[PDB]
């Protein structure tokens, strides 16, 4: 599916000089902000700096999310990129502080390296002994390559896996002795015909070759929050996915912080600091900000990127207004990146990119009109008309979106400004702020 930021596929900057290109990777304009963001990527990728809070500020639209989403695309898969809407911090399960602590620790990765041994071979024989009316199980697996054959004892856990997988002679299987996962890969020869209900036919494979065992390094990245959850419990690691973690006690996290440092010095773990993107941060309250002040001071703090639309605005949980809706002793810790409203030549480029992403073929006149609509009504509204006009054009079986299709879309769907006028022009027939309304004609 196509979404609001699907065209954004990077930050669009020269990796050498960090110079923003005027158009690249789906981003247009905002060059100062895109350059400032490119520098923050270097701080993230180097990882040495802890707890720098960057605020992207600007009026609505202007790409504050688009830039932050461009950064996510530039960091790639290994680095954590936790996105919070600030409204997620308010919870009934846990305090706001606990919700912030978890989100901070979600943004720090721990890249564990482990070495595992996998078997692979043709099953030549399988033998299982089962107790009558009881759990006791034992068995032996005879397994083969073109160059080895050996008989392995099976425990109860293997026998459960072996029957879940319906391992039969001639199956090619591999077994990771560390995890105990069994996978079938095919068969060395046809499934025998005498028995019925023998299941779906497999792939063919030639027999595996060389040694049965081989060692294999495997790398797993987990957040510090996952480690918190696993170690706060004997049982219930489902809480990692379910929420339901409660307010994890701080003496557990102290221990985890020490152990992760120990794992790092031992070379067991590589710590991978990522970013917490908080969107619409002006939704946090005064207690949240007082916590974040000092969460940033840890050497395990991620870099925290924030976005706000707000002018001078009231701080939540507070009597008084402040710039961005953020308190001043918080803003003392924060550098601000400013986004700016677009030029018509930028809107034309952005709309062209949206049209390509949505696979919509605008005529040049339709693009000109959409650009003009974009100046009067906003970039989002004009981008919605692209999809609408495509549909309307298709119903009349036109090859391309014409001005006629854009005009009809504009006719059908109200500009956020026209809707405000419509609301004013029917103040008596809409329900007021004091609840009065008239239903009569």
């Amino acid at each position: 599916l196509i979404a609001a930021h699907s065209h954004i596929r990077g930050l669009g900057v020269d990796a050498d000089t960090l110079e923003p290109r005027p158009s690249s990777q789906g981003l247009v304009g905002q060059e100062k902000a895109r350059k400032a963001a490119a520098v923050v990527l270097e701080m993230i990728k180097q990882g040495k700096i802890a707890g720098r809070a960057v605020l992207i500020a600007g009026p609505p639209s202007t790409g504050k999310t688009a830039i932050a989403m461009g950064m996510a695309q530039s960091l790639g898969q290994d680095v954590p990129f936790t996105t919070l809407a600030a409204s997620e911090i308010f919870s009934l399960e846990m305090s706001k502080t606990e919700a912030l602590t978890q989100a901070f620790r979600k943004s720090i990765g721990v890249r564990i390296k482990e070495e595992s041994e996998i078997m692979e071979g043709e099953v030549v024989e399988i033998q299982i002994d089962r107790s009558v009316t009881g759990g006791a199980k034992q068995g032996k697996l005879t397994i083969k390559t073109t160059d080895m054959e050996a008989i392995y004892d099976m425990g109860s856990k293997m026998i459960d896996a072996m029957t879940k997988e319906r391992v039969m002679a001639g199956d090619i299987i591999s077994i990771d002795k560390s995890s105990g996962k069994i996978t079938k890969l095919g068969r060395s020869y046809a499934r025998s015909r005498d028995y019925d209900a023998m299941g779906v036919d497999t792939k063919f494979l030639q027999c595996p070759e060389g040694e049965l065992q081989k060692r294999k390094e495997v790398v797993h990245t987990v957040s510090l929050h996952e480690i918190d959850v696993i170690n706060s419990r004997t049982q219930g690691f489902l809480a990692l996915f379910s929420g339901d973690t409660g307010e994890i006690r701080s003496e557990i996290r102290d221990q985890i912080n020490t152990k992760v440092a120990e794992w790092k010095e031992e070379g067991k773990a590589e710590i991978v600091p990522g970013v917490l993107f908080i969107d619409e941060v002006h939704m946090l309250d005064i207690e949240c900000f007082s916590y974040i002040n000092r969460a940033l001071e840890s050497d395990l703090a991620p870099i925290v990127i924030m976005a706000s639309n707000r002018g001078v605005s009231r701080i939540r949980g507070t009597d008084y207004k402040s710039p961005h809706g953020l308190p001043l002793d918080f803003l003392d810790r924060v550098v601000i990146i400013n986004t700016h409203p677009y030029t018509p030549d930028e809107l034309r480029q952005i709309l062209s990119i949206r049209a390509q992403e949505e696979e919509v073929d605008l005529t040049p006149d339709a693009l000109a009109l959409l650009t003009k609509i974009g100046q009067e009504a906003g970039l989002r509204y004009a981008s919605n008309l692209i999809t609408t006009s495509q549909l309307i054009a298709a119903k009349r079986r036109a090859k391309q979106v014409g001005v006629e299709d854009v005009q009809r879309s504009f006719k059908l769907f109200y500009d956020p400004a026209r809707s405000v006028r419509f609301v004013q022009e029917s103040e008596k027939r809409l329900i007021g702020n004091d609840g009065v309304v008239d239903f009569s004609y």
């Binding site: 930021h5 409204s87 308010f90 399960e93 489902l238 379910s242 929420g243 549909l391 004609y441």
Partner: protein, 459 residues
């Protein structure tokens, strides 16, 4: 056992029972009176494009606002969309009131409904043998093992369905299931080929007379083929996959079993579960074994959402797998529910309002009211004189569309209790006097409640 009710099975009727669709040409132009709609031609034409947007499955997380006064047909238009899409497309309607759960943060409630609105269709083959067990019979092996009393090479089972008989030459290992399931001759079972095990459905009711007393429920013989291989289509919302992962159902241990016996509170599911679900779902879509069905989340009275709800929907709508969200509002210029000093149009925050395609619904002309009266009358089955249609429509113009429509059922009763099947002005004139409207009743409050000491309204 159950005594079948044979007489009648007629439908009830509710406020929207007449709405049957958007009533649009093949060109998408609205007909002035079709599918139960009268007027709103522009609003119906816009909703027609919305139906085409949804049915095209191209786009995620587009917002639509239905804006207009109370009674102007906004929920009628939403219900018409749901009918235009048909039941294959998910449609999750809520009010903004429904978000304030006591069990979880309201943004979890919003995200739950958000993923109810996304359907997944999965096609798989089901492949089982079924019947009553006619026979069970070992075959000795030709090479019996040393030191063992018996060696069995096959275990024959005869299965009978209503449509055939088959001898299953099963692998000997099925002895395990037969013992543990206690399969007898005459029990109804199935054997599934992906495991080779069996499960006992019950004892066949062909044996319900074996004893005067037995602790058996008897079950009919399967009325399918003895071997059932067919493709099966499974429809699940992505919310069903969330819950199936966050609250696994089948657990055999004491803690699982105590769990399923206690109150099953919902839980604030993590983004990493939902994200991990999304990524595997997308694997199967690329394999072509599943298809995504993006539906509609309809939020009625969206002015009841607060600013924390709206700021979350910003994030939610940006996700690649998201429904179309349709809001409806009627609140003019109003305070945002969570931000007591911000007033905005529709009661929707201006930050969020910029996202929405806005569709206005206008008031109705007197002649549209009269047409609706007749459509509503023929839906409630009320028969009217034309003078009664006029008198009712006059209340529609002077008072409210809803009020005049509501008099038809009272007036129908007052007519038949005078032996008349056709309602006439004399009946309308009695319904309207037994059943006041909001304004005439409010005039009594002003006049009789002019004082409160006794016999006055509490104020």
């Amino acid at each position: 056992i159950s005594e079948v009710r044979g007489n009648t099975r007629d439908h009830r009727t509710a406020a929207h029972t007449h709405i049957k669709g958007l009533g649009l040409n093949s060109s998408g132009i609205a007909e002035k009176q079709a599918a139960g709609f009268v007027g709103q031609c522009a609003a119906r034409e816009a909703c027609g494009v919305v139906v085409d947007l949804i049915k095209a499955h191209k786009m995620a997380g587009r917002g639509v606002l239905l804006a207009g006064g109370p009674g102007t047909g906004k929920t009628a238009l939403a219900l018409a969309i749901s009918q235009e899409l048909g039941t294959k497309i998910p449609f999750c309607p809520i009010t903004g009131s429904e978000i304030y759960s006591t069990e979880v943060k309201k943004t979890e409630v919003l995200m739950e409904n958000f993923r109810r609105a996304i359907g997944l269709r999965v096609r798989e083959t089901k492949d089982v043998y079924e019947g009553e067990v006619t026979e069970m019979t070992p075959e000795e092996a030709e090479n019996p093992l040393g030191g063992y009393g018996k060696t069995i090479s096959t275990l024959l089972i005869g299965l009978k369905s209503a449509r055939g008989q088959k001898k299953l030459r099963l692998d000997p290992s099925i002895y395990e299931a037969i013992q543990k399931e206690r399969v007898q001759v005459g029990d109804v079972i199935y054997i599934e080929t992906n495991t080779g095990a069996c499960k006992r459905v019950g004892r066949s009711d062909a044996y319900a007379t074996e004893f005067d007393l037995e602790a058996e429920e008897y079950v009919p013989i399967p009325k399918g083929e003895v071997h059932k291989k067919k493709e099966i289509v499974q429809d699940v919302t992505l919310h069903d996959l969330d819950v199936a992962n966050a609250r696994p159902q089948g657990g055999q241990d004491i803690i699982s079993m105590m769990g399923q016996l206690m109150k099953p509170k919902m839980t604030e599911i993590t983004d990493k579960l939902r994200m991990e679900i999304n990524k595997v779902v997308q694997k199967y879509i690329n394999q072509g074994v599943a298809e995504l069905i993006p539906g509609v989340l309809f939020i009625d009275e969206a002015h009841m959402l607060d600013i924390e709800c709206f700021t979350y929907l910003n994030k939610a709508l940006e996700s690649p797998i998201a429904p179309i969200v349709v809001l409806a509002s009627n609140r003019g210029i109003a305070t945002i529910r969570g931000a007591d000093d911000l007033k905005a149009a529709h009661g929707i925050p201006p930050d969020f309002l910029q996202r929405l395609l806005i569709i206005p619904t206008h008031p109705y002309e007197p002649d549209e009211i009269r047409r609706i009266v007749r459509i509503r009358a023929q839906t409630e089955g009320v028969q009217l004189t034309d003078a009664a249609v006029d008198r009712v429509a006059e209340h529609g113009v002077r008072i409210s569309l809803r009020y005049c429509l509501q008099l038809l059922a009272p007036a129908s009763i007052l007519a038949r209790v005078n032996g008349r099947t056709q309602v006439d002005v004399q009946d309308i004139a009695e319904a309207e006097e037994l059943f006041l409207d909001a304004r005439r009743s409010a005039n009594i409050l002003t006049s009789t409640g002019e004082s409160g000491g006794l016999h006055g309204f509490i104020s």
